[PDB]
Amino acid sequence: KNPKSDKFKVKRFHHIEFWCGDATNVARRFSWGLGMRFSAKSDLSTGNMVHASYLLTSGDLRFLFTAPYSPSLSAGEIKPTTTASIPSFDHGSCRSFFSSHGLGVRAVAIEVEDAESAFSISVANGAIPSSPPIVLNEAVTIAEVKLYGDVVLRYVSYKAEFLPGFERVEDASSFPLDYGIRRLDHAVGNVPELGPALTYVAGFTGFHQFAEFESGLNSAVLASNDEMVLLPINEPVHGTKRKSQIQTYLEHNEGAGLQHLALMSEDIFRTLREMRKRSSIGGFDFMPSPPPTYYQNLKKRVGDVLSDDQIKECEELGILVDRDDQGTLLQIFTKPLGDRPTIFIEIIQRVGCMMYQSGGCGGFGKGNFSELFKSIEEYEKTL
Amino acid sequence: KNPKSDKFKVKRFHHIEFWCGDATNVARRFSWGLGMRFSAKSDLSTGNMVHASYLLTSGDLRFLFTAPYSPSLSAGEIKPTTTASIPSFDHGSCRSFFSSHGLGVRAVAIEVEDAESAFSISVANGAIPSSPPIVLNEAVTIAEVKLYGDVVLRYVSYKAEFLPGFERVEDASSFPLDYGIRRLDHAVGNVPELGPALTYVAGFTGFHQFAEFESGLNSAVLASNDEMVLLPINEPVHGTKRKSQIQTYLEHNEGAGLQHLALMSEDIFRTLREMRKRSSIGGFDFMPSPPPTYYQNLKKRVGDVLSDDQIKECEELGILVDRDDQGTLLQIFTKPLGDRPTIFIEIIQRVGCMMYQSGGCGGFGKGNFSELFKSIEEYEKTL
Ligand SMILES: Cc1c(C(=O)C2=C(O)CCCC2=O)ccc2c1c(=O)n(CC(=O)Oc1ccc3ccc4cccc5ccc1c3c45)c(=O)n2C
Ligand SMILES: Cc1c(C(=O)C2=C(O)CCCC2=O)ccc2c1c(=O)n(CC(=O)Oc1ccc3ccc4cccc5ccc1c3c45)c(=O)n2C
Ligand SMILES: [Co+2]
Ligand SMILES: [Co+2]
């Protein structure tokens, strides 16, 4: 059931902001690896003496990469006179974030009807404020509250092109790469304690529990009214045999933070062909593929949704498949995006739940823990 | 004249080490942009709990990219028990370097006959010590002295594959990229005061002045006995009309540091074709090309070294050409490698001075300041 308890009007995921040491190199690597085009910039060339910020887009997916310049360039500025295009940015906060966590997501941004109202309502309902609502060029309002760890939930609302102060990117520097990724499907946090994290976020958003769940973790998913904003949260399970990967995350990340971004593709076969061609020439690596037994077991599980040829294409690309009582999920996971075994990416595509497609169709792949373990056991048994 | 005054036996440039926020993303970007293969690693997967270091190679050119992990991973270690493969590494030094300067070169490494002797002689002759000689696996010795700013000159000597503790890279992650780059030709520093910088470095190395030189800078070049290790140093010229780019460097870098790396190609035409194909898909951008008048003027200057077709190929690729009384230089410059207008790369190839080719054949392109200015003036005149 969906109680539709959102305490303010939420639209969709708007962007994800990475805090970086060098935004240029991370943005260029991600552009080539994921097939995202350079779409906007705010940096020295646009008069920003504070931070370098580069926007990549693929369809509706927006990835922002931000790094601080020397504070000496802006030493005479005050907030009323800032040349920063993102008024919540702070040199010390950014350097401290990156020193503590390494490369990772600082902001999960959702578009709302009124960022000032969303901020006020959130804080009235327990949200810890991070940056107050600030109106940019009387046209866009931005506000930030703490989500978990040093990750913020950023509210953005538009009166009527990314943010004022950003410039569209020179067409010769904007190569029209596109591997089929179209939007952010969900964004997942790792925390030490799931219960208090859920109570806090659901407390100030009104987001309701969408789903939930003996291998490493406990998880639950918070969702907006139309279930298009999806925020799963994990905690570690202590007392196992293999060490919890959630605990490994928390250790290497120095605490809670964003674990993975799941990116919807309109053609997951094409996306994975293109990404895998580039893994060893600057792109992203993928997790080891499941054994042949996993794909033999796919016939009995999804033989009514996917043809034998489509299942063979999943096998060639290492794609995992899970299913709901309503829809089917195709998914695959990258290796970590940077030096630390912390943040990674998931590529997904969902089949079913046609009404437009309902959010979360097919679930999040929890059934693939069991199915993977079973297939590994069968493959070693084949010996 | 060459006094051959080296105070210890120097062989050749060995490697350049970048200090990074995230080594993975910088290394992957550079690999694709420059056509360098992933050759060795030292990181969590090799038991290094301290730093992540990735080695790229192209021919004899070695680029090392290093970033710190959370200090919590190695908190129980002491130097006698370190898991770091580069014993001079320090978390605080690396974070402070990167916070101050952004992405850039920490170490210019030269191979010497005996790194302990080179270190002792250097310090006896005025070098400021940075890291004492440390023997790794009774097989390689490494030592470091201050060069300028926070850049060190690193001595490496081998008893008889990069460094002990590094592992050769998995062949599936080692794509054999190669755009023709073969070695480091020279490495250039920017300092506030050229005179004291020259006196200091020549003081402790015995390197002699190779060359020297009204547009922005004063420069001089220090060279080893066989003039294969070449270290130009620049200072700003104050009082001009256009602001000194050396002064802009010092401002955005927070002081002295490495300005550019000049990479010799065995086929500069192929290297630039390959690099330019990749500029807008994750690689490196190049400076704006000279006007058509520059290439018309090339005929009268190097028409005896380069055919008309070869000059047209230089024009298609934006390559600059200068000449000595002994040799000819083909060169081109990238835009800055990262967020700040600080470090950039030069691709070069030298013609002449055949004996093997003598080091520095054709000079460093100082004649192209005048020639560029003249050609820009002629092109606007063509109007
Ligand atoms: C991340 C994820 C989801 C997911 O999206 C998700 C949510 O959206 C919300 C609900 C909670 C949740 O989970 C769903 C299914 C997944 C995965 C996933 O990440 N992965 C791969 C893996 O576990 O990665 C790793 C990582 C580190 C390892 C270290 C050591 C290992 C030693 C042996 C075997 C391993 C297998 C996988 C391993 C590792 C090991 C999977 O298989 N499924 C099937
Ligand atoms: C870097 C370099 C060398 C070189 O290797 C070298 C050494 O090895 C040792 C000896 C000293 C030395 O110098 C030789 C020749 C060069 C260059 C070189 O860097 N460049 C390009 C440029 O000046 O870059 C820039 C950078 C920033 C600018 C900001 C604003 C500008 C406004 C107008 C015009 C510009 C032109 C160039 C500009 C800029 C402007 C060149 O043309 N030659 C011809
Ligand atoms: Co997921
Ligand atoms: Co040069």
From Swiss-Prot, chains A, B:
One of its GO terms (molecular function) is iron ion binding. Its main location: cytoplasm. Residues 12-158, 183-335 form the VOC domain. Keywords: Cytoplasm, Dioxygenase, Iron, Metal-binding, Oxidoreductase, Phenylalanine catabolism, Repeat, Tyrosine catabolism. InterPro entries: 4OHPhenylPyrv_dOase, 4OHPhenylPyrv_dOase_C, 4OHPhenylPyrv_dOase_N, Glyas_Bleomycin-R_OHBP_Dase, Glyas_Fos-R_dOase_dom, VOC. GO terms for cellular component: cytoplasm. It is an enzyme of class 1 (oxidoreductase). Its cofactor is Fe cation. Pathway: Amino-acid degradation; L-phenylalanine degradation; acetoacetate and fumarate from L-phenylalanine: step 3/6; Cofactor biosynthesis; prenylquinone biosynthesis. PANTHER family: 4-HYDROXYPHENYLPYRUVATE DIOXYGENASE. NCBIfam families: 4HPPD. Catalyzes the conversion of 4-hydroxyphenylpyruvic acid to homogentisic acid, one of the steps in tyrosine catabolism. Homodimer. Belongs to the 4HPPD family. This is 4-hydroxyphenylpyruvate dioxygenase. It comes from Arabidopsis thaliana (Mouse-ear cress).
